Amino acid sequence: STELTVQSERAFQKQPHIFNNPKVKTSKRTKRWYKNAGLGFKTPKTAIEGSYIDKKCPFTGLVSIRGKILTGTVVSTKMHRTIVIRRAYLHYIPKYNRYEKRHKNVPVHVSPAFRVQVGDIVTVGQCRPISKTVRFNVVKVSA
């Protein structure tokens, strides 16, 4: 998201400790910082080329991916910079020896590097609690 508005907040957005110098001549105009989370998740080129600033982004922001790595179907693109996915499963009831369709809707942060829609399968990795409900972050879109 972030819809083409770079400096839209009351406060100035910048990455912490990433200093651009006005004295020197430069063809970048923003020393950018980035990393590869690991585990085989390619840092999307849109993250490195991107103009946005996201503190919660797993590639450009100050957050690490450790713990479970899950996958789910996106169900809600309504909130800004976040989505709700519905991870389905089937619960085994021993007495009847059969299953029942269950589900859970976990919220996860979505960095502006990825552009999603509802109905797309996506992989998210657990991170440090970044909100009241969000505990995961999007790392790769299968769809």
Partner 1 sequence: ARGPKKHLKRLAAPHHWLLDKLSGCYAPRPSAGPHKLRESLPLIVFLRNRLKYALNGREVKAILMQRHVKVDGKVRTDTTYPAGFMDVITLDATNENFRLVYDVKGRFAVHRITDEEASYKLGKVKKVQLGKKGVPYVVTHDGRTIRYPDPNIKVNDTVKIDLASGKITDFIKFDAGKLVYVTGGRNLGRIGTIVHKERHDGGFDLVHIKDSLDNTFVTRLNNVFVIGEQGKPYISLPKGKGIKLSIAEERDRRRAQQGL
Partner 2 sequence: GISRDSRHKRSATGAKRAQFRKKRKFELGRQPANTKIGAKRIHSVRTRGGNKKYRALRIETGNFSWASEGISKKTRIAGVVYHPSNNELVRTNTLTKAAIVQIDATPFRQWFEAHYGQTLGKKSKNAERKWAARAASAKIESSVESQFSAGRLYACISSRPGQSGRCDGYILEGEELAFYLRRLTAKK
Partner RNA sequence: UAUCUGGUUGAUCCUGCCAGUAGUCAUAUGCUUGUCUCAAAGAUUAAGCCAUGCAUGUCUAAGUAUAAGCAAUUUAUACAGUGAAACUGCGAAUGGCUCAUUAAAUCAGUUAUCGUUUAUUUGAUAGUUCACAUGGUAUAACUGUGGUAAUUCUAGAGCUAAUACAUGCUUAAAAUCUCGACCCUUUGGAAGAGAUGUAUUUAUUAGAUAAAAAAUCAAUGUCUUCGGACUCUUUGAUGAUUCAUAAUAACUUUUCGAAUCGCAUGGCCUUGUGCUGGCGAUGGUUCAUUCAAAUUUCUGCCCUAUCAACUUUCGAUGGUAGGAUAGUGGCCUACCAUGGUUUCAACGGGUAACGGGGAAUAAGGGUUCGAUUCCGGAGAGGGAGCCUGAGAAACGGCUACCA
Partner RNA sequence: GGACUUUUACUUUGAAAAAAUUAGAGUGUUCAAAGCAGGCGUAUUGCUCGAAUAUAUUAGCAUGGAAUAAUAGAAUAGGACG
Partner RNA sequence: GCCCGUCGCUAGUACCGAUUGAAUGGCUUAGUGAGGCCUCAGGAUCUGGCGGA
Applying CB under 8 A, the residues found at the interface with partner 2 are 7, 9-12, 14, 19-23, 107, 132-133
Residue 111 contacts RNA per CB under 7 A: no
Tell me whether residue 3 or residue 9 sits nearer to partner 2 (CB atom): 9
Q: Which does 92 bind (CB under 5 to 8 A by kind): RNA, Mg ion, partner 2, none?
A: RNA
Burial per residue of 1-20, b for 16 or more beta-carbon CB atoms within 10 angstroms, e otherwise: ebeeeeeeeeeeeebeeeee
Question: Which of partner 2, partner 1, Mg ion, none interacts with 69 (beta carbon under 5 to 8 A by kind)?
Answer: partner 1
Identify the CA nearest to 59 among candidates 38, 36, 82, 83: 36
Residue partners of 133: CB distance under 8 A and separation at least 6: 107
Region of residue 119 (left: phi > 0; alpha: psi -120 to 50; beta: else): left
Provide the binding-site residues for RNA, judged by CB under 7 A: 9-11, 13, 15-19, 31, 33, 35-40, 42, 54-56, 62-68, 70-71, 76, 78-82, 84, 87-92, 94-95, 100-107, 109, 121, 126-135, 142
